Design a protein around this ligand. Structure first.
Ligand SMILES: O=C(Nc1cc(/C(=N\c2ccccc2)NO)cc(C(F)(F)F)c1)Nc1c(Cl)cccc1Cl
Lengths: 1340, 52
């Protein structure tokens, strides 16, 4: 047990013990980038690897070589926080040592000179935070891991649809990690073909010739040999007795003076056995049997020296005669069978246009780059640079691995390029599949699916950067002089920097972390995608890949995946899942040796898991863990059924691992249909943090792990006692055992305070500990947004009643009491960052000055002398946050305006008001202001005030650091001095500064005192340098965009509670929109007089089948019961005994659960705190599929004083009369998604307009009007409304005249329209007429 | 040509300064009044395709 577990404990139902506990949920993200940037003294993936690949770069034959030595990542220019505030990128300089050697022309190889240029700078690269996040511009971002087709070879079917002959086809595909694709495919005529990439189809053998294989050797490779002998006269044949299988006798088969088979008798196993035992090597055959046989090799006349027959040519009765008289004894032919061993390659040669190697290379080079005249060196260079070049091609490790494995090879690791043996073996495998031996693989299987991650992809982009820098290096090394340039002038920065910046900045996989929520972050960081680079698209891949595969078990969550344009093209990583060594997906299991189920953990990949029979997470075993049933439900290969007691190799580790962390937070999930469950776990990520982090009243037990593993909370680095607790910071004094000898020290935690979150919500941390409290190592020292006492509260539980209330709950609609909006529980805090830009126009510079044309004293009131709003001033819509004015000269007025100015004597200002004003309707309080200034332009008054303030605050902070740290350090010297030197009262008298002189008796403690001295002075100077650096960071002008002189950022904190139109939902996939806010007066209540918070609609329950939401209600009620009872017994102030008794009774609950319990806990000061935290309700943990049962809940209801049915009598708060029938009341945990109505709501009358085509367009955040589409138009057409439609697409929108001419009539009180012609069609006329097309408008 | 001259400085002074030269560095590095950088650096840029 831990220390916050003494604060609060969650009652846990369920039986199955957890053999393995949930690992770090952020594992994958951190591991990836940990591999990317790192020093690996070998070819393993990392910057080192990608470096070694392209390097060393040598010039063209000129013997000027540039080789790579070693690299380093400098310390970040700005730390996480500073870089987040300022808005720059959190990164490190990449400093790489390069050695430029120049070989003395005319080797033996030695260098005239080699300049080692010290660490030339190329690019800065982003860094991953401890939370697995990146900051691109001042914003936390995540790179989603990718799922693609693993490299190597793959054999498919493509039966059915092609050709409709049903004959199917068989194709192989070699997909490298990088480089051109290699494809082989058959056709209806059984002619083997080959294509590089998706390009033109070529006869297979044409590649073989390019490997320098003459026809004879191709045949020798793909066919066996049938030997014909002309011994004496009239032939003979060599016969392997197995050759006659699957064939019928073509003639009398007789040898050894004994007739084995006659004519017309198919050769069976009998004939074959007879031939085998009698051992007949040579038989006599007719001269006519070779009429169809194909001659293996070439044959010439020894005398005439002329070619008798070419290789792979059909023999005739005459050709035999023509090669027989020439003195030929032996004739080799192809062994061909239309069933067993097929004659494919022969016919393939029959379709081959080429002859020799050069010819093949010609057709290939003319295939890849067609239309341009081929050249020998060109074809050679191409073909050698396709699959055989170390540069332009590679499968890497996973590729070579899967390649060799699928080829039934031995070697698990090999070269990164293809070999003749490789291509040949692949072709052989394809031919074997067409022959009937071997099977075809499927893509959907997770063994063929590889998982990438941040580091790998970043490595790829950096690789592209390195190749484009390589081209430049060679380009310059072409003409270069000797000892002038060095590895600086060549290598640039921007090419690489933008190469990585383009990846992190804009990519489909690189996105902004969704931080509205601790679950959202952690479930985003664990995610998979089949989209992006190196993957399919929604418009391409069909239903197969999207669909769930049995291999998804334990690897990928079946029920968590977005519902929309891409379904199952994303999914999520499962709970206990891990990335395999080679990059596949493997899940934990339990090895079952003999008859015992062992607790040893074993990880099996998608392919590893295949043959083994795995048992069930839900299975009955006892004592030693032997299976209770004689047969138990299991799954072995692709399928599940009942299995013998001991046939079982393995078993599931947990009742969880099938699902993900999102689904694992859904209580009573087993009681919910998969559709609504999916919707539930989908919306659970949308929950906006509440004002008061509450707690789930009905839990799972994952919510602790989610809260802790996600970076939202603050966890103790080391255990000890709290020296200091503030809403700002928390200082813990470290225990000695955990403490390091030097520096002594205490752990100081600076808590994040109110600040902007990516979703504009609020992120703020509060201390969960009090002054002088014991804290265990790895314990929550504070809670983040939407977290309570180390658990995850995504929302707030509350009283719910199921019953129709006056149709206000009508569809999914939710009827909530006033008690909720009054208690401000569902209230939310939004932090909006608003910006003001001071730019440069040709008319002049823009000023932030407080002097604003046309504003009242009340308008300039909330602004200081400089024109920026004070910190803390509450503002609403229309208030001026930052005064800004831009020059616009010579207004060029008109006559009546001129008379007006002449009468009123008003000077029309040369300046126009651009001031940043709070967006319409939104209202909040200003929590901060920042001023970014171009370096070298004078800081204004306000900015200076702020700068000085920040300087002082910094000095105070640093001074606090040094004080707490120094006192903490000397407090150790006091303790060590007392051992061997002890003077209690004598020591603390003299000044502390002079303590360092005092020694000690000979011992290691003297050297300890020495340590404390060294580290003390270290801290003392470190303070100095840190102060200096902080000051410089404050004063320096941040680099801004072109034209912008200065920028003012105001941070508004808006507080919106709840109003009709907001979206709310449970964890069960039941949505709703708050309909009306009903007084506590009209609320249905019970006999006790306690009203209900929320009234749902029962009708929503049966149709969409989620019954869990009802169970969640019931248990919830019962849970609250245990609270209320305790709430009374605390209000009765009984004693420790009664309380403890009741609590224990609650935590036991009938029989057979795994929870255990107390009275190892201090019976007074500890227990009474737990009971104090339990009075709000009794938190319960319902495991995913291991969760509670009806009987357990009813029992808990008995303990609660509440009915079994979970239904009580309810009275209308209006009439006061009872409602007929009982109604279900309880506590259902409910969230608030951020759909909030004051966001969604939009209205526009007359706004701005698009330039290119005049159409309504919002430029002000004042929204463009709704889009009237084709379907809406049809809807108008169906009715008889012509004028509604005309006014819709003419005057209200597209007519540059009609709109204004309309407006004047609308204000004049005349409703008409003078439509004219829409500008769209008017432009179409010009576009058409711009061509050679004359379009005109006839008649009148 | 004036723009190109401003590129040359950027090259060396990029790695030389460890990040990049300040917007006013190449200014004194170049002959003319040197405040023209911001001006010259502006008009040089090619307009982004409106169809982007
Ligand atoms: O997926 C297949 N069968 C298949 C079998 C089952 C099954 N039992 C299982 C139960 C749990 C896990 C895995 C299998 N049945 O008793 C379930 C599915 C499921 F997708 F709906 F979850 C598919 N067959 C299959 C194979 Cl083996 C390869 C490629 C494509 C398919 Cl469609």
């Amino acid at each position: 047990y831990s220390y916050t577990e003494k604060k609060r404990i969650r009652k846990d139902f369920g039986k199955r013990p957890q053999v393995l506990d949930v690992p770090y949920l952020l594992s994958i993200q951190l591991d990836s980038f940990q591999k990317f940037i790192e020093q690996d003294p070998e070819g393993q993936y990392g910057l080192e690897a990608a470096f070694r690949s392209v390097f060393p770069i040598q010039s063209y034959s000129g013997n000027s070589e540039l080789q790579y030595v070693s690299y380093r990542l400098g310390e970040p220019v700005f730390d996480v926080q500073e870089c987040q505030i300022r808005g720059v990128t959190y990164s490190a300089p990449l400093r790489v040592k390069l050695r430029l050697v120049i070989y003395e022309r005319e080797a033996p190889e030695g260098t005239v000179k080699d300049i080692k240029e010290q660490e030339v700078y190329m690019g800065e690269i982003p860094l991953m935070t401890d939370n697995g996040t990146f900051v691109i511009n001042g914003t936390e971002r995540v790179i989603v891991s990718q799922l693609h087709r693993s490299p190597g070879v793959f054999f498919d079917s493509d039966k059915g649809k092609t050709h409709s002959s049903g004959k199917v086809l068989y194709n192989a595909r070699i997909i490298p990690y990088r480089g051109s694709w290699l494809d082989f495919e058959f056709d209806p005529k059984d002619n083997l073909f080959v294509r590089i990439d998706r390009r033109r189809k070529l006869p297979a053998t044409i590649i073989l010739r390019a490997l320098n294989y003459t026809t004879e050797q191709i045949l020798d490779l793909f066919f066996e040999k049938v030997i014909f002998e002309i011994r004496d006269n009239k032939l003979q044949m060599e016969l392997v007795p197995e050759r006659l299988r699957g064939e019928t006798a073509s003639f009398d088969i007789e040898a050894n003076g004994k007739v084995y088979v006659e004519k017309g008798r198919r050769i069976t196993a009998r004939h074959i056995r007879q031939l085998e035992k009698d051992d007949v090597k040579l038989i006599e055959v007719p001269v006519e049997y070779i009429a169809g046989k194909v001659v293996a090799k070439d044959y010439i006349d020894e005398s005439t020296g002329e070619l008798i027959c070419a290789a792979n040519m059909e023999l005739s009765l005459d050709l035999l005669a023509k090669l027989s008289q020439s003195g030929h004894k032996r004739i080799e032919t192809l062994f061909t069978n239309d069933l067993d061993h097929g004659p494919y390659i022969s016919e393939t040669l029959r379709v081959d246009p080429t002859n020799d190697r050069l010819s093949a290379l010609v057709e290939i080079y003319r295939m890849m780059r067609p239309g341009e005249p081929p050249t020998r060196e060109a074809a050679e260079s191409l073909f050698e640079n396709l699959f055989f070049s170390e540069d332009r091609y590679d499968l890497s490790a996973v590729g070579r691995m899967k390649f060799n494995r699928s080829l039934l090879r031995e070697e698990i690791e090999g070269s990164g390029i293809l070999s003749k043996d490789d291509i040949i073996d692949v072709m052989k495998k394809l031919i074997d599949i067409r022959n009937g031996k071997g099977e075809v693989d499927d893509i959907d299987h997770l063994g063929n699916r590889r998982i990438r991650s941040v580091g790998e992809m970043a490595e790829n982009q950096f690789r592209v950067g390195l190749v484009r820098v390589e081209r430049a290096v060679k380009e310059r090394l072409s003409l270069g002089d000797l000892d002038t340039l060095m590895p600086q002038d060549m290598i640039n920065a921007k090419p690489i920097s933008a190469a990585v910046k383009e990846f992190f900045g804009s990519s489909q996989l690189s996105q902004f972390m969704d931080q509205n929520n601790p679950l959202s972050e952690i479930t985003h960081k664990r995610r998979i995608s089949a989209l992006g680079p190196g993957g399919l698209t929604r418009e391409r891949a069909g239903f197969e890949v999207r669909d769930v595969h049995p291999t998804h078990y334990g690897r990928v969550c079946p029920i968590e995946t977005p519902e929309g344009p891409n379904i199952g093209l994303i999914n999520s990583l499962s709970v206990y899942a891990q990335t395999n060594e080679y990059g596949f997906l493997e899940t934990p299991y339990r090895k079952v040796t003999d008859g015992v189920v062992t607790d040893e953990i074993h990880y099996l990949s998608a392919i590893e898991e295949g043959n083994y029979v795995i048992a069930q997470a839900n299975s009955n075993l006892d004592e030693e863990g032997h299976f209770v049933e004689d047969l138990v439900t299991c799954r072995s290969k692709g399928e599940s059924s009942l299995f013998s007691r001991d046939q079982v190799d393995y078993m599931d580790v947990s009742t969880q691992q099938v699902v993900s962390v999102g689904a694992s937070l859904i209580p009573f999930l087993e009681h919910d249909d998969a559709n609504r469950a999916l919707m539930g776990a989908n919306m659970q990520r949308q929950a906006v943090p509440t004002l008061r982090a509450d707690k789930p009243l009905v839990g799972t037990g994952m919510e602790r792990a989610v809260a802790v593993d996600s970076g939202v909370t603050a966890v103790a680095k080391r255990g000890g006692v709290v020296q200091y607790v503030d809403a700002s910071r928390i200082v813990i004094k470290v225990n000695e055992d955990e403490m390091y000898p030097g520096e002594a020290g205490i752990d100081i935690y600076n808590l994040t305070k109110y600040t902007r979150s990516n979703q504009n919500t609020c992120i703020n941390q509060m201390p969960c500990v009090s002054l002088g409290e014991p804290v265990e190592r790895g314990d929550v020292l504070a809670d983040g947004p939407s977290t309570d006492l180390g658990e995850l509260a995504l929302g707030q539980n509350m009283r719910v009643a199921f019953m129709p209330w006056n149709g206000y709950n009508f569809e999914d609609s939710i009827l909530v009491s006033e008690r909720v909006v009054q208690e401000d529980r569902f209230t939310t805090i939004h932090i909006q960052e608003l910006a003001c830009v001071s730019r440069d126009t040709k008319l002049g510079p823009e000023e932030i000055t407080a002097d604003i044309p046309n504003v009242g004293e009340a308008a300039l009131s909330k602004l200081d002398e400089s024109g920026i709003v004070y910190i803390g001033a509450e503002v609403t819509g229309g208030d001026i946050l930052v005064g800004k004015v831009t020059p616009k000269g010579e207004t060029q007025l008109t006559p009546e305006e001129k008379l007006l100015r002449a009468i009123f004597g008003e000077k029309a200002s040369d300046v126009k008001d651009s001031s940043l004003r709070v967006p319409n309707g939104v209202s909040g309080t200003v929590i901060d202001v920042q001023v970014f200034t171009r370096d070298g332009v004078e800081k204004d008054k306000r900015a200076l005030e702020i700068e000085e303030m920040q300087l002082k605050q910094a000095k105070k902070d640093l001074s606090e650091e040094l004080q707490i740290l120094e006192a903490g350090l000397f407090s150790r010297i006091r303790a060590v001095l007392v051992a061997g030197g002890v003077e209690a009262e004598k020591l603390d008298k003299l000044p502390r500064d002079r303590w360092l002189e005092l020694g000690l008796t000979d011992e290691e403690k003297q050297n300890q005192l020495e340590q404390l001295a060294e580290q003390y002075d270290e801290l003392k100077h470190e303070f100095e340098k840190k102060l200096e650096a902080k000051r410089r960071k404050i004063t320096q002008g941040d680099d801004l965009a072109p034209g912008v002189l200065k920028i003012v950022k105001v941070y508004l904190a808006v507080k919106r509670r709840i109003q009709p139109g907001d979206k709310m939902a449970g964890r069960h996939g039941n949505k709703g929109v708050i309909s009306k806010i009903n007084p506590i007066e009209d609320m249905p209540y019970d006999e006790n007089g306690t009203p209900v918070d929320i009234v749902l609609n029962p009708l929503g329950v049966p149709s969409r089948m989620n019954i869990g939401q009802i169970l969640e209600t019931h248990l919830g009620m019962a849970a609250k019961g245990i609270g209320d009872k305790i709430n009374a017994m605390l209000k009765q102030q009984q004693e420790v005994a009664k309380l403890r008794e009741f609590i224990q009774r609650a935590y036991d609950l009938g029989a057979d659960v795994r929870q255990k319990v107390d009275l190892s806990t201090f019976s007074d000061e500890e227990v009474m705190r737990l009971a104090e935290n339990l009075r709000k309700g009794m938190p319960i943990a319902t495991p995913v599929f291991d969760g509670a049962k009806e009987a357990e809940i009813k029992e808990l209801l008995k303990l609660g004083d509440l009915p079994t049915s979970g239904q009580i009598r309810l009275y209308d708060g209006r009439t006061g009369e009872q409602f007929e029938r009982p109604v279900t009341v309880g506590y259902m945990y409910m969230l608030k998604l951020n759909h909030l109505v004051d966001d969604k709501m939009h209205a526009r009358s007359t706004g701005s307009y698009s330039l290119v085509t005049q159409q309504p367009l919002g430029g002000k955040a004042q929204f463009g009007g709704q889009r009237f589409g084709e379907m809406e138009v049809w809807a108008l057409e169906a009715y008889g409304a012509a004028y509604t439609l005309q006014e819709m697409l003419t005057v209200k929108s597209d007519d540059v005249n009609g709109r204004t001419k309309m407006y004047k009539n609308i204000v004049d009180g005349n409703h008409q329209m003078e439509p004219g012609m829409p500008e769209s069609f008017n432009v179409l006329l010009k576009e058409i007429r711009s061509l050679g097309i004359n379009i005109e408008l006839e008649d009148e | 040509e004036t723009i190109n001259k401003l590129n040359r400085i950027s090259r060396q002074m990029l790695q030389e300064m460890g990040r990049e030269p300040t917007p006013e560095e190449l200014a004194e590095r170049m002959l003319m009044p040197e405040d023209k950088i911001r001006k010259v650096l502006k008009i040089a840029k090619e307009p982004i395709s409106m169809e982007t």
